[PDB]
């Protein structure tokens, strides 16, 4: 990119629905990078004292200048971000100052930055409307549910593992399964091995795959099943 003379995006945006394995994509980048990786929990920034969370922000950016070409990753930022204003319970003013310390350390009066910053959470709607605007972030990617062609590759990467009977078409299994997150997609291959005990089977067959449709999917719907249920609050 030095030939065109452009500016690579400093931050990125990954939120998506819960259950798509977004944290797995963050670890896949650290493998190819072969450098220092930093995973930050949203609840870790808030300490047991008022004002200590402001020092916790500079602890992360101090290693950026000390250790060059590293990666920082924030997890569950919804517990931190958002304006939340004033008139509420009144104990909310301590958390809103963490982002104001984080934004200042990211883009301040002096544009000091090197590495890439990753913000991730399950609730993009509850965040700061300033945090949802660019200039701290450029690339914005939101995960979606794989289609019939997309869900087929989910069972293909798992087909090399476990035990797959020769002559079984995985495109029919992902087709009977409705649209769902990758968390429930990998549960089909895992539970299929459980039928080798009670159902009196050697390996996972096509019959055990059809029983998993009414079990892994239809049986586990009930309540407390997220997928696309909670997109907002």
């Amino acid at each position: 990119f030095a030939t065109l003379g452009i500016d690579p995006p400093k931050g990125i945006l990954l939120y998506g629905p819960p259950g798509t394995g977004k944290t797995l994509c963050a670890r896949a980048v650290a493998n190819r990078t072969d450098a220092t990786f930093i995973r930050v929990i949203g609840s870790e920034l808030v300490q047991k004292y008022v004002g200590e969370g402001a020092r916790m922000v500079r602890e992360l950016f101090e290693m950026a200048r000390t250790k060059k070409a590293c990666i920082i990753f924030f997890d569950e930022i919804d517990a931190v971000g958002g304006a939340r204003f004033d008139d509420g319970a009144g104990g909310d003013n301590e958390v809103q100052r963490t982002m104001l310390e984080l934004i200042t350390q990211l883009d301040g009066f002096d544009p000091r930055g090197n590495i890439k910053v990753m913000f991730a959470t399950n609730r993009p709607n509850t965040l700061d409307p300033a945090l949802l605007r660019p200039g701290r972030i450029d690339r914005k990617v939101e995960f979606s549910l794989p289609d019939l062609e997309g869900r087929a590759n989910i069972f293909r990467i798992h087909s090399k593992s476990m035990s797959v009977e020769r002559g079984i078409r995985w495109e029919l299994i992902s087709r009977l399964c409705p649209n769902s997150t990758g968390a429930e997609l990998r549960s089909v291959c895992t539970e299929a091995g459980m039928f080798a005990i009670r159902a009196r089977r050697k390996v996972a067959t096509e019959k055990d795959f059809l029983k998993a449709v009414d079990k892994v999917i239809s049986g586990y719907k009930k309540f407390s099943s997220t997928s696309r249920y909670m997109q907002y609050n």
Binding site: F1, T3, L4, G5, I6, D7, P8, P9, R133, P134, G135, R136, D138, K140, E142, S144
Partner: protein, 86 residues
């Protein structure tokens, strides 16, 4: 200090492109009219995506369609995860 006006965004987009490489055939007053009430950083973010588009297509310089496709992508008040035309 409200949002920038119409003709004011034409001068802002031109300044952030001084470090880039183009053919100078792009009308900056035309791109400003395609932007309705966008933040100042949202204006500079368009030039960031315009450079990334030419890297995928292998172009040696940023052309007109790079800034136009950047608006179709996610920059300011534009989000699409699928075509969805019916």
């Amino acid at each position: 200090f409200p949002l920038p006006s119409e003709d004011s965004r034409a001068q802002i987009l031109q300044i952030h492109s001084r470090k880039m490489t183009t053919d100078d055939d792009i009308n900056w007053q035309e791109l400003a009219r395609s932007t309705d009430e966008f933040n100042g950083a949202q204006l500079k973010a368009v030039t960031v995506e315009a450079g990334m588009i030419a890297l995928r297509n292998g172009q040696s310089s940023v052309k007109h369609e790079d800034f136009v496709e950047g608006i179709s992508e996610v920059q300011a008040r534009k989000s699409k995860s699928v075509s969805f035309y019916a």
